[PDB]
Swiss-Prot record, chains A, B:
Compartments (UniProt record): Cytoplasm; Cell membrane; Secreted, Cell wall; Cell envelope
Lineage of the species this protein comes from: Bacteria, Bacillati, Actinomycetota, Actinomycetes, Mycobacteriales
Name listed for the protein in its UniProt record: cAMP/cGMP dual specificity phosphodiesterase Rv0805
Description of how activity is regulated: Ca(2+) acts as an activator of the enzymatic activity and is able to promote the hydrolysis of substrates even in the absence of transition-metal ions, thus providing an effective strategy for the regulation of the enzymatic activity. Two Ca(2+) ions bind at a site different from the dinuclear transition-metal-ion binding site. Activity is enhanced by magnesium or manganese. Activity decreases in the presence of orthovanadate and phosphotyrosine.
This enzyme's EC code(s): 3.1.4.16, 3.1.4.17
UniProt entry keywords in alphabetical sequence: cAMP, Cell membrane, Cell wall, cGMP, Cytoplasm, Hydrolase, Iron, Manganese, Membrane, Metal-binding, Nucleotide-binding, Phosphoprotein, Secreted
Coiled-coil segments: none
Organism: Mycobacterium tuberculosis (strain ATCC 25618 / H37Rv)
Function: Cyclic nucleotide phosphodiesterase with a dual-specificity for the second messengers cAMP and cGMP. Can use 2',3'-cAMP, 2',3'-cGMP, 3',5'-cAMP, 3',5'-cGMP and 3',5'-cUMP. Hydrolysis of 2',3'-cAMP produces a mixture of 3'-AMP (major product) and 2'-AMP (minor product). In vitro, is 150-fold more active in hydrolyzing 2',3'-cAMP than 3',5'-cAMP. Can also hydrolyze the model substrates p-nitrophenyl phosphate (pNPP), bis-(p-nitrophenyl phosphate) (bis(pNPP)) and p-nitrophenyl phenylphosphonate (pNPPP).
Amino acid sequence: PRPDYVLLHISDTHLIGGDDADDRLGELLEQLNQSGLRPDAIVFTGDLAAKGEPAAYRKLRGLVEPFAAQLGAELVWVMGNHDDRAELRKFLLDEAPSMAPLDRVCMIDGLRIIVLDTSVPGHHHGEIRASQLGWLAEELATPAPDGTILALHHPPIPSVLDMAVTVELRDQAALGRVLRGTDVRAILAGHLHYSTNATFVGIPVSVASATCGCNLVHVYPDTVVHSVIP
Amino acid sequence: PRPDYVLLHISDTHLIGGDDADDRLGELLEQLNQSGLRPDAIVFTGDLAAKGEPAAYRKLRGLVEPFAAQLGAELVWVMGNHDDRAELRKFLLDEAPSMAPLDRVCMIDGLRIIVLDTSVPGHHHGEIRASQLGWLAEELATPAPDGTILALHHPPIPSVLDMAVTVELRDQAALGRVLRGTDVRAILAGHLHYSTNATFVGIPVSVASATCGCNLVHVYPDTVVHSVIP
Ligand SMILES: C[As](C)(=O)[O-]
Ligand SMILES: C[As](C)(=O)[O-]
Ligand SMILES: [Br-]
Ligand SMILES: [Br-]
Ligand SMILES: [Br-]
Ligand SMILES: [Br-]
Ligand SMILES: [Br-]
Ligand SMILES: [Br-]
Ligand SMILES: [Br-]
Ligand SMILES: [Br-]
Ligand SMILES: [Fe+3]
Ligand SMILES: [Fe+3]
Ligand SMILES: [Mn+2]
Ligand SMILES: [Mn+2]
């Protein structure tokens, strides 16, 4: 059975200035390059840079872009709590610096990938602004031919650890009312630094662990398969 | 947030006669015992013994029962392709030897756990007999207060590897027609020897990797969370 789409789900790389998460990610990219995988997209669900440093984004971009271009894969970057919106826009995206949420829509043929920004500047918990929910609702009003993958950092999933509660995504009910009954087929997330899956308003949520392995995502006609790659 | 139920999902232990999967499982049980976890049930989703040997089941029973009794957890054993129904019944369950499918229902308070046998004696692929589907349909006609966890070996999930196709669960459509619209909240499976999750007729399927880590399952009021424990 050939899947309709193949996605690489990587998260929590936590790169720093430079003096380690650098080598851990290099080895991963090298492994996946030698596996012969040819993904349609590579989605990085947040905490890309450990302290949101400019030097870390330039480093990340230099490691990842040759990898993605060789595979012909689309790159999909997501904000995490440790990232800085302005520095990410400047040094990773080549866009004008802004503190506005990093929200974006990306079509892979018939597959829609929506990037949402659950980060809260200067803070570690997650939250989604009313403006973002309106944006998302408007976007989801039109269905994609192959449905939608939602990509964000803070997963809408109960915190199974005490430590995780204080940095969880807040006000999940509101995101739930927007997502319910839409063509969202899967939610890709990070933040937890261990592999987890659950549903949120009937939609499967898959959290990839930290790089500092990853997940393979096979999109089939009637299901989405997530495989944990150690 | 306290979950309603906590389950331990272990799979593919592959114990042999004795001359290694023995030590790998011992270390796991020891770890989980020192973590302070207190699960309601411990579900083993098949391939318990590598060659279905009597000596392997006695060995498994001797390692696991003291572990389960100390935790006050219910033990839930499932048939895999490498197991032998008769030897498992004799040496693990203290039941009269039979080659009939190992199908069973188990209530944990309001939570129903259904064990299904996807094994095919002498073969490695999975299949479910018409008699079993009738049985299952009849059982699922009455809802459980907290819904149902279905536990089986061969997952109803597309095979993302060529090697896996020839030993996959066959005739999934028929299982699907029975499960659709029931109170089945999650399907626990093994067989793949790596962590995987997907849905099957809208129901989340979680495959635990092989012991030869495991999964923690938190059952919440509105969701089931699966965490991969390396
Ligand atoms: C779990 As964290 C402090 O890397 O967002
Ligand atoms: C994947 As197998 C041969 O242990 O059923
Ligand atoms: Br700015
Ligand atoms: Br904001
Ligand atoms: Br956009
Ligand atoms: Br499918
Ligand atoms: Br017999
Ligand atoms: Br049979
Ligand atoms: Br029964
Ligand atoms: Br819940
Ligand atoms: Fe992180
Ligand atoms: Fe096995
Ligand atoms: Mn985070
Ligand atoms: Mn098996």
